[PDB]
């Protein structure tokens, strides 16, 4: 088989974490227009038959707790797993409403060994966030 | 036995080390394209091919507009990182 089995009772979960407002300590400005994105994703994943769950303004800690709880859930009847992160960030880092959080830490809860009910199944992470401070000027075609 | 890091796909809105762009009212360029391409091709194209379309739409149809010359006229290219072992189809 060249294709993932997507004919399970459920397509799976689609956790969308949208952080718009940040603690003064961080310094980052609010992310206006991010609600339009979270809302757009919800509707899109709903049509693809995913069980969407929106989470707004989560602290660095609340993010880890959420991911860990979701990973410890039983996905035996789900085809896959989608996780969207809309927030500020740096290379390999995603920002909670209060501070920095490594990406490798979130995805690890879903490694084949830590999440048996998702082994061999597609685990997608869509990350909207910066990954540095480099600017792409482009070039004329 | 399979690798514990297998079956993961990371769709980054931008290339490593780069800024990601967002429009104050319309939203982030990446999510916009991603939702548009998903709405249009999820019933046909495999996921990787759909993400390639998102790459092209973002790369060609977006350009930054800022009152600060520094952040003006900048482009963006998304970055797909795949450790999938099979083709991903949302339909059956």
């Amino acid at each position: 088989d060249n294709s993932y089995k997507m004919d399970y009772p459920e397509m799976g979960l689609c956790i969308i974490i949208n952080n718009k407002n940040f603690h003064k300590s961080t310094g980052m400005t609010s992310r206006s227009g991010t609600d339009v994105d979270a809302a757009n994703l919800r509707e899109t994943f709903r049509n693809l038959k995913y069980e969407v769950r929106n989470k707004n303004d989560l602290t660095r800690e609340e993010i880890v707790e959420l991911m860990r709880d979701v990973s410890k859930e039983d996905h035996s009847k789900r085809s896959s797993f989608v996780c969207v992160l809309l927030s500020h960030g740096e290379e390999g880092i995603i920002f909670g409403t209060n501070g920095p959080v490594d990406l490798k830490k979130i995805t690890n809860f879903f490694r084949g060994d830590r999440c048996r009910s998702l082994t061999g199944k597609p685990k997608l992470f869509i990350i909207q966030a910066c990954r540095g401070t480099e600017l792409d000027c482009g070039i004329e075609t | 036995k399979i690798p514990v890091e297998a079956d993961f796909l990371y769709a980054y809105s931008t290339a490593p080390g780069y800024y990601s762009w967002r429009n104050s009212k319309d939203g982030s360029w990446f999510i916009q394209s991603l939702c548009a391409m998903l709405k249009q091709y999820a019933d046909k194209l495999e996921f990787m091919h759909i993400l390639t379309r998102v790459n092209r739409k973002v790369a060609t149809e977006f350009e930054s507009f800022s009152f600060d010359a520094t952040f003006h006229a900048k482009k963006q290219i998304p970055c797909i990182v795949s450790m999938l072992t099979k083709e991903l189809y949302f339909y059956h």
Binding site: - | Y19, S20, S66
Partner: peptide, 5 residues
Amino acid sequence: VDVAX
């Protein structure tokens, strides 16, 4: 306008 993320 467009802003960084």
